C-alpha cells in the first residue's frame, strides 16, 4: 500500500520534507487589488520574490482556496502514478474552504482520498504529516493513522503559536481589540480551529517570552518537543525564538520554514512563530 500525502500551501511545509516524507503542496491563490493572481508555490525563489513584492506593494492582496478541480487534478495525477491512497491534511475548516474543496473533490474520483481537517495552519500542519508518514513507514493502516492523529490532536499535541508586529494584516484578512502602539507585538495561537489573540506586549524579547509562556500553560518545562520555526521573512526573529525555546524544553528535532504567500498575506512580514509537537509531557 502506497500513500501520497498532500498539504495545502498554507501548511508552509519545509522544503526538504517534500521529497523526504513524500508530501506534496497544493497552492492556494493570492489576488491583488488590480485583479492579478498568483499561486502559492512551495519553491524558495518564488516565496522570496513575493516577500520582496509584498514589503514594497501599495496594497495587501486577498487570498482564495483551491477549486474542487485543482484538487481533482492532483488526485488523478497520484492515481496515474500508482498511489493506492491519498491522505490530505488541510488548514482549519474554520479559516478556509480548502477543506470543503478537498472533500468535494474526493467524491469525483476513484482513488480513496481521506481528508483531515487539522484545525491548524502554517508550520503546525506538517507535524501531523510527518507523523503520518513515520507510522505508515512502520506498517500502519490508514485507519490506524487517522485514529492516532485524532487522539493526538484532541490531546492538543500539535500547537500553533506566533506573533505579528502589525495587526492590521490579520484584521484585513478577516480571520480574527488591538489598536496601534510603538514596538507592539500581538501574540496569537490557534484553539479549536480559530485564531485567538491572547497578549499584547512590546518588543521581540517579551513577545518570545509570551509565546513560550502560552505553550507552558499545558506542557510543563522540560517536555520532549519537535518544532518547526516559521517566519515571514524574519529569520533572525525565528532563530531567537527557537534558542529561547531550548532553555526550557528538550527539543529533539527542529527545522525552520519560511511562511508562504497566503500565510504572509494574512500575518504580515516580520511575523515569527512555531508549530510545536509534544512527544512527551514531563
Ligand atoms: C505555526 C505558527 C504560525 C501560525 C500562523 C497562522 C496564521 C493564519 C492566518 C489565517 C490564514 C487564512 C488562510 C485563508 C486561505 C483562503 O483564502 O482560503
Domain spans of the chain, in order of start: 2-154, 155-282
CB of 268 sitting under 6 A from ligand 1: no
Into which CATH architecture does domain 155-282 fall? 2-Layer Sandwich (3.30)
Q: Residue 172 phi/psi, 5° resolution?
A: -65, -40
Q: Name the residue of 89, 92, 121 to mutate for ligand 1: max ligand atoms within 8 A of Cβ.
A: 121
Query: What was the structure determination method?
Result: X-ray
Give CA separation, 134 vs 139, 142, 250, in Å. Answer: 9, 12, 21
CATH 3.40.50.10170 fits 2-154, yes or no: yes
Q: Is 275 in the pocket of ligand 1 (CB under 6 A)?
A: yes
For residues 229 and 237, give the distance between their C-alpha atoms in angstroms, rounded to a whole number: 10
Bridge partners (DSSP) of residue 7 are 25, 89
Pairing label, strands 85-90, 3-8: parallel
Chain breaks in the chain (C to N over 2.5 A) after: 176
> 3-state class of 224 per DSSP?
strand
Tell me the three cell numbers of residue 255: 527545522
Q: How is 48-116 classified by DSSP, letter by letter?
A: HHHHHHHHH-SS--EEEPPPHHHHHHHHHHHHHTT-SEEEEEES-TTT-THHHHHHHHHTTSSS-EEEE
Kindly provide the resolution of this structure in angstroms, with one decimal.
Answer: 2.5
CB 27 within 8 A of CB 38: no
DSSP 219: S
Q: Ligand 1 center to residue 139 CA distance, Å?
A: 33
Distances (CA, A) of 13 to 17, 23, 26, 171, 261: 7, 9, 11, 25, 12
Amino acid at each position: 500500500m502506497k500513500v501520497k500525502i498532500l498539504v495545502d500551501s498554507t501548511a508552509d511545509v519545509p522544503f526538504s520534507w517534500m521529497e523526504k516524507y513524500d508530501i506534496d503542496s497544493i497552492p492556494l491563490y493570492v489576488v491583488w487589488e488590480d485583479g492579478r493572481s498568483e499561486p502559492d508555490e512551495r519553491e524558495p525563489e518564488e516565496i522570496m520574490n513575493f516577500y520582496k513584492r509584498i514589503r514594497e506593494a501599495g496594497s495587501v492582496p486577498k487570498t482564495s482556496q483551491p477549486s474542487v478541480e485543482d484538487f481533482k487534478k492532483r488526485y488523478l495525477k497520484y492515481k496515474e502514478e500508482d498511489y493506492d491512497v491519498v491522505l490530505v491534511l488541510t488548514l482549519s475548516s474554520k479559516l478556509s474552504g480548502t477543506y470543503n474543496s478537498a472533500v468535494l473533490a474526493s467524491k469525483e474520483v476513484d482513488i480513496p482520498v481521506y481528508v483531515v481537517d487539522t484545525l491548524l495552519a502554517s508550520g503546525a500542519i506538517p507535524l501531523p504529516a510527518r507523523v503520518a508518514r513515520e507510522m505508515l513507514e512502520n506498517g500502519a493502516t490508514i485507519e490506524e493513522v487517522l485514529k492516532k492523529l485524532d487522539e493526538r490532536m484532541k490531546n492538543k499535541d500539535f500547537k500553533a503559536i506566533f506573533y505579528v508586529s502589525n495587526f492590521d494584516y490579520l484584521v484585513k484578512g478577516g480571520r480574527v481589540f488591538v489598536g496601534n502602539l510603538l514596538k507592539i507585538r500581538v501574540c496569537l495561537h490557534i484553539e479549536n480551529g480559530e485564531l485567538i489573540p491572547y497578549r499584547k506586549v512590546r518588543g521581540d524579547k517579551k513577545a518570545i517570552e509570551a509565546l513560550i509562556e502560552k505553550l507552558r500553560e499545558d506542557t510543563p518545562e522540560g517536555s520532549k518537543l519537535r518544532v518547526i520555526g516559521v517566519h515571514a521573512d524574519n529569520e533572525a526573529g525565528v532563530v531567537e525564538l527557537l534558542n529561547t525555546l531550548r532553555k526550557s524544553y528538550e527539543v529533539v528535532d527542529e527545522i525552520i520554514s519560511p511562511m508562504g504567500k497566503v500565510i504572509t498575506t494574512h500575518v504580515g512580514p516580520g511575523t515569527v512563530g512555531f508549530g510545536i509537537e509534544v512527544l512527551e509531557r514531563k
